[PDB]
Amino acid sequence: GKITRRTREAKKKQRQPIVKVCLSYPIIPQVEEGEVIDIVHERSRGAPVAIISFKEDDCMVPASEGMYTGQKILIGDDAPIDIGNITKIKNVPEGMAVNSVESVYGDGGTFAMVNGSYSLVVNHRKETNETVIKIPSGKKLTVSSECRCIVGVVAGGGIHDKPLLKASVAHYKAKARGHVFPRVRGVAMNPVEHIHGGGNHQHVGKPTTVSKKDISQEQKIGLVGARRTGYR
């Protein structure tokens, strides 16, 4: 055989990468006052980015829905509750939506940083200083009560409300983001390139669930380690 498409698309990307800018906020224990100086678009992202200026430091963060240029926000551990306002996660009531939550007290942000997402604060277990939160995927996770966050949802709304509708729109999206476009189906190739192969009719020819444990790398194509298949 020859080497399959999955493995070559991985090698092309170490030669010529897609790069995003790494948003994060700094450490400031005393309550300061910031200044949104600009909100801007970025290639390969869907969310707009805000430029906020402190007394001796500037930062780039995901803008929340409800920000505007020239607005003042506060940073510090004991800061008041309002859209924006980087503050510590024990000063936040239950049922409130936050974004860009860190996990180690000083790493910037880790959770909920894409277009239109947030995490939920569910419980404050005041003994042991633990906070249960819900992250965007649904998993529940206890963090310390000293990690910081941002109040509100990320801007950029529901981007899937509008269909792509046309070939050229999927062409411009994959140029900016790096998806495989177009995709030739594996059953339409010759056997030399794909485990799905030739044959006098187009058909896979054997089970499409494959293992995730113990088999050769380059055999893991299809539905890898699937617990269940079917419509519902």
Next chain:
RNA sequence: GUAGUGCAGCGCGAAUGCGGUGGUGGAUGCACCGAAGGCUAAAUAUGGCUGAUGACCGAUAGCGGAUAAGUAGAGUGAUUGAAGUGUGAAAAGGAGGAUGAUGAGAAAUGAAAGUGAAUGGAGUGAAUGGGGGAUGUUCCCGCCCGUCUUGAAACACGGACCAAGGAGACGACGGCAGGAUUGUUUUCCGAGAGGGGAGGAUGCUGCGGUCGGACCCGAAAGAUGGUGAGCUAUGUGUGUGUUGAUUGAAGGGAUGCGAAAGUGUUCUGGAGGAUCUAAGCCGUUCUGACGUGCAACUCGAUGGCAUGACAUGUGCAUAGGGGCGAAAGACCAAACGAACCAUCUGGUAGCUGGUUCCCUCUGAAAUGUCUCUCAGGACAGCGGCGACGGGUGUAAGAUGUUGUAAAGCACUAAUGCGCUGCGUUAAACUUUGAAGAUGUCUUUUAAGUUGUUGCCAGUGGGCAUACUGUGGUAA
């Protein structure tokens, strides 16, 4: 190196009257030696350079290269790579022709294939050859060689013509034959334990055997080390190109209807992978032209697309079991279901083709056994060349063996009648039974006049016919 012969990774890790070794793992005597630091001439190997030699080659030979040869030339590149010697002793001199001069000589020699001029003979028959005769012919005979084949003049293959070159030689080890010199030659049997007297050696020439490029020329492939994205494919940086029309979305104005909710008409505006046309780009049909071309993909007419998921110059990134692909196994410098260059490499070939002087003496086989054996091989059979050595491929007299042809019903198996006879059968039936074959004795029957052994080749696709079977409607 046979149960480490030597070396290495990982882990464990010594001794001080002590340590190591002794062709089978371990023990114990006796023998013999001192590792884990260092240096050391000579006798041995070998491209090239310089001297000296030769039963070596003599211009298609010998090094690729006897000369302005690793040159001229070819390839993007790594790489690749020829052909060509001669006036004379002396320039004493020529170089369109003619007339001349110099010289020993117009000047190295100068074959065949093929041609021009003159002159002799013949012809309207393909030509050419042999016998017999004659300054061409008249009569007789005569199809084109080489090769594979049961079988070729073949509608089987190679061969237009001429010259030169062109294929069983050499090394090692063994045997035999012929020949040369010398001769006071021999470590035996047996797994072992045990037992125990019986003419060659060293050269020379030839032939048969094996391994060597191995009689000469020939694959599809495999591996080691290198070159390419100037063609073409995808990504990315920076530039450039695109005429004139058609249709008429949202938004906005005015005007009519109606109790209201609402709705009619018409202007303005200029959307959309919306419709043509141009600069231009492709490649549907004519199955048009052309088809030793204008051309290793072109030309004419017709048709399709022309704001894009476009077209195009240039910087950078991706390389061969790898890349790149809106996917055709497509494309990667005129060959891609694995590129190109050099080496290993004179790669192997049970298969096809070729294999060079005369006369003379003998002269086959196309069958049996074993074979991943069936287009091959070995052993045996048939043949050649020997050498040494003395004494029946036909009949007659006697005496044995046989179960076919024909015939028959005694056994086995069949087959009609008449109520003891008449009728019909046989490769796997036989009570009988030939012609023909086949054993032994006697040359103390006729007629005639071989034994022992050495070294070796080719052959193992057959076919026809008289008589005689088997299968088949038959050939």
Next chain:
RNA sequence: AAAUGGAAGGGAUUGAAUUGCAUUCCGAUGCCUGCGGGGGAGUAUCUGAGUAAGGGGGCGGUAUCGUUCUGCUGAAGGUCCUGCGUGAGCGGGGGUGGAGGGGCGAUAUGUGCAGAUCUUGGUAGCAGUAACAAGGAAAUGAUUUGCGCUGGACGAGGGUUCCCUGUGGCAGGGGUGAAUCGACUGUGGAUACGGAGGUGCAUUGAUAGUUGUGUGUAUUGCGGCUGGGAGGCGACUUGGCUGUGACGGAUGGGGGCGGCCCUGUCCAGGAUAGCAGAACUGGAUGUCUGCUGCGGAUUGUUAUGAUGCGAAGCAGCGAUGGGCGAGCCUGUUCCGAUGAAAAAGAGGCUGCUUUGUCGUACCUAGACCGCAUCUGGUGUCCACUGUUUGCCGCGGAAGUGUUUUGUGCAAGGGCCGUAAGGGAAGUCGGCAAGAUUGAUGUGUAACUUCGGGAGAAGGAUUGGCUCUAGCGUGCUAGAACUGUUUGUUGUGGGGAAUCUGACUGUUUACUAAAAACAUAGCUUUGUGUGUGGACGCAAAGUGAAUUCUGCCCAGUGCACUUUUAGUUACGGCCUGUUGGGCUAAGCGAGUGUAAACGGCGGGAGUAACUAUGACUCUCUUAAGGUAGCCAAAUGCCUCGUCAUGUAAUUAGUGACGCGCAUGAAUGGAGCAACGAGAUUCCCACUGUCCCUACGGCCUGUCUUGUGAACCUACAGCCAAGGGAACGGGCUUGGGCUGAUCAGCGGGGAAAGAAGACCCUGUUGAGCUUGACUCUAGCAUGUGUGAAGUGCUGGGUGCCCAGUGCUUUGUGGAUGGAUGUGGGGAGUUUGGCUGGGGCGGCACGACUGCUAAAGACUAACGCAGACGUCCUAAGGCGGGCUCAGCGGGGAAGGAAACCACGCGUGGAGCACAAGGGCACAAGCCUGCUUGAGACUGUUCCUAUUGCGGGACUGUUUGGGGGAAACCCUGGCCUAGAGAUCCCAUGUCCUAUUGUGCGUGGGACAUGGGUGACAGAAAAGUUACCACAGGGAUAACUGGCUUGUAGCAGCCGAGCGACCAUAGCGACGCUGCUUUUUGAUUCUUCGAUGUCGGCUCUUCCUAUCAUCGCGAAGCAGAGAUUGCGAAGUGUUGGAUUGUUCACCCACCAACAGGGAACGUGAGCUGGGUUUAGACCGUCGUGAGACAGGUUAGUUUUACCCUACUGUGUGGACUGUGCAGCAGAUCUUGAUAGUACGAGAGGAACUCUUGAUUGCGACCUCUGGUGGAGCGGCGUGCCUGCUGGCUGCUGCGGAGCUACGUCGGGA
């Protein structure tokens, strides 16, 4: 009774082809006899063919040593003539040549050529041929005139090709000048992006943003002088700093560099027969985007608007002749796309001074690449005018390129034009051509995703001239007049249905553009972190919307769990004499999952005529195909059945459904819109055809110049025969024509290419997996690594598990073990065989027959059997008689048991068949383990192993029997396994000495190779390769004739009677070569493989026409037979078809052969390698004589054949060869003969035609680049007159659709 004209060998022959004879004769390289030569032989002689193969004796090339000679008074080599030798070869003479050359003996070898699609060099025929060139002219040609269209600059590439002089292309000498052009400088990149600096005029033979010059701008350095504030309410003015570089597509409005057009005036130019209100040409002149103060509510656009967060207006600041637009100014809009980076800031007025290095000539295609002076390819910029929406098409300028003594046109080609009447009858198929076409009124359906369909369809108008109306001044609307009726001198064919893909897009550079690929939408899976943080990132399937997406978890796969089986490795620990316990993942098990891979049944009865089966029983599955759809691109049978379209329907559409083998994201149903996709029909239109004609230009034909190639054993007329079974040459017959030129495609099984199909080889490679043997990676225990401490749990004080803490090692790794692993590597996948494959085993082995009276003897010949079985079914002693028949005996029968008289085996003996056997080899019965331990000779059986039998000997040996005697398995012929390795027994043994809980050997048995003298082994190729094979298939020929076709003989019956008018059973005998088989002789270094179209010839077994018989022949119409091959034998619908089947006509619509006639004659529908779809089959790569769609047709100029032509008068004779007309019809005969009637003929006379053949142009039709006319576009200034385009008529000539012409 057979297909080119032909064979007792020919002419012929009445016996010169019949039969019987011998008293004559002819006839070999054989025989006898005399000489000559070779080889044997024991020396008075005898004996000679020969492939593969072997032996003896000779001839020749080049050298050495070792001897012996010759050449300038002319060597070798070469050429002609001549002697000797059976031959290989060796001598002499005359020319030429100008320096060396030999004999004899031994010895060393790169030692002798006709061939190898041999190597290198030279040369023929073809052939003065193919191909290419000959560009418009004027005696001259710096002058006059005719035609074509690229023309001018920068880069890549080239490198002196550029200028002058001399010369017939060379030779000699010249020419490239930079602050203000590019680069040397920026950025991870650069001659196009960023960036200190300019414009005119003149100048050389050749350079110029570079030389010279008028004016400007920047810069290097060096000076001199001078200022840190004035104004304005404000916007802002001034020597008075911290700004820029720096950024996408589409589209409206305003305004324009240059160019072009219209117009007033002035100065000039060129042509003119005549006329022209005074033409034609050139030149020169002819304001508000914004901001501030006052003001205090309205105001504007082509469009969206602006405004108490301050409108209009007034006053300022700042910026900057008429008409058709490039940069520029100012708006709106589009994106899950939002449109680089770095170098480079300071500044007033003046004077002197500086400015480095390298490139610069010439060429856009005849100066580049494609081997070239090649119709191909090659980045950027500029370029006038009439007509027009158009920078297109159809015509003109500017600039640029170009010659001046070949012919005038046969046939056949390449590219075009016009055609009576018909109108797709042509063809696989409307292929090709014709037809529609611009603009403006009118009028527009089904359906539909409401947007579309739509330029639907269908109808009408159009020039020129002279005016009117509107306002925006060039467009729009209206009217009169006029012509030989006509005006776009350009620009879509349309309509009704079915299959299929949603749509715009992409693809096999060089045979496939598609239904294939992509696509939005829909669904499933994994993943909490990569610079990226789940509206993310990655992997698969299906393919817009609408409506739907059923049932199956038994098999395979995937997931989770093993906190309630089993199985399992290194190391460690435990216990013990070298064993056993404890400590993984995985496998196994349990549960879940089909938008995972996939699957989705038989049989019996049953409703008041039949028929069917709602209903029932029954077998059975993991579950038994649901909703829908169909002879559909999916249905074998099959051209299914019914309806509809036609004169006629293997086509199309509608309907039906037990569907070989339909069916649900393997996606099912479904067609709005779109398509150079596949199909069928309608209108229109036509040279597609009936059936061809005439014309144009370039070729060809003829001349001069330049001048190839392929191919070539030798050659080139036929019939038959035989032959390797289709001859140019051989045997027996028949023949044109003495040497030319143009044509042409029958033959040379023509050329090209070591057959790609098929088989064989112990030859490959691409790809697959449930082949064999392995392997990267990954999983999971475990060894190494860093010190100190606490904690909970196991067993017996113990070892270990997790385990938190402390800081003072570190996280980078590294050794071995078990599991997994077509992701990857290497390799294999027998043979025989009436081709191979599938099947069978004739592959080891036993019996009978085939087998021809000793033994041996073949076939995928015939009929069977073998891989076992038995403690007796082995050994021995004794006693008995078997199958069956006859006469008897209570219940007793066809068969029970007793018993007498006979019984040659007619029964038994493990199993196949054959042989054998009676006080036995059979049956019953007693005792036993000879089915013992060793050892030698021989047969099948040989050149030979294993195996299976026979016969002896030796035993401090058995069993049976009184004993003689027998016994080493089975009554005899089948039941069978090497080398190497391992297991057990007996006898020996390890070389420095001795042992051994460690090994080695000899001999004998067992463990097994059935392909049985004995490898360790799965598939596929239509993507394919190489060595061969006519030892072997798929087409033609040849032999054969079962089958196929056509005929005879007999006489049982039939025929109202009557075997034969006509028929003819049951049986029997032939012929042909048109069917399909059987075979494998020719061809695999190639003989182009189906049908049609076109064209010629032959056969007869006669369909019609001519002649003539029979009758169950009255006439009419037919039926059956003989002579006879001269002439005829058609037009259409459906299918690729051959074939078939229907319609119409006809005198009739017969059957066959010629390499299944005919592809350098065509066509290419069938078949048809490489793309693709469906059904069934396979885990898969793939398969199917199952269906469907898309898919290169090369070369004659040679010889012969054939057609003409040439090969030297006039008038004729006579031999040979060719050979043509055929068929139908009107009237009369005649309503007659014949007949009860109904019906209904003939000879002779007569009228017209159809088709073939040969001519002709008076008439009619076609053509007519001859000629005359009409209407246009551009150009000559307009009129006149020309040239160019479209159109009507159209003589001569040619032609058919027109006219003429057949023996007594």
